[PDB]
Amino acid sequence: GETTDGVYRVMTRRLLGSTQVGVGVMQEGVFHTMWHVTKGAALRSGEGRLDPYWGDVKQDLVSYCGPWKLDAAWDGLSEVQLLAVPPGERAKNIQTLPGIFKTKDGDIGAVALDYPAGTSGSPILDKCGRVIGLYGNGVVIKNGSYVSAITQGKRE
Amino acid sequence: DMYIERAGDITWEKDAEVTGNSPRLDVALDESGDFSLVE
């Protein structure tokens, strides 16, 4: 299959027509997405098969073909870019200054950008183009808008 | 049967559209991976 680094749509033909259920990142031969996009199922890339290798429902993350490779972190000061890949629409960079999710176990950056559910998995990048996490797991706030955590895995 | 299709390179774009606010929220993360607001 196609193994070139980059951002990819995750599609299904199970529902009406071809439906985009999410997005992910190919880096160093490993495909990275959010658990809720694939539910841990196998994926196809052309005639090739991508099998799950690691996953965790609480982190809402999954890697295919190898271990999680993404380890850049938001610096807590600077603007980042969401590389939004919405269903049926061209990849588009959106720049924003993250907010913060404060938890009993520490703080994480959060982006206040509202896209369709099939955009989940889209990468958030720093100024060097490194992926600091994936968009698509978050909360619905007072006015009904959406705020996503910047979800990042651990590189073993 | 899920399948993937390339949508682009991962790069920073100079002069991209700039939007969104920066809210500071108190949240809880449950065992199912769901975030919820804490008040």
Ligand SMILES: C[C@H](N)c1cn(-c2ccccc2)nn1
């Ligand atoms: C109501 C929901 N949060 C929503 C979806 N969309 C949307 C944005 C970009 C592309 C396509 C659709 N705008 N609001």
Ligand SMILES: C[C@H](N)c1cn(-c2ccccc2)nn1
């Ligand atoms: C501290 C580390 N940079 C981190 C944690 N997480 C995370 C987000 C949601 C659920 C689980 C984990 N994303 N990045």
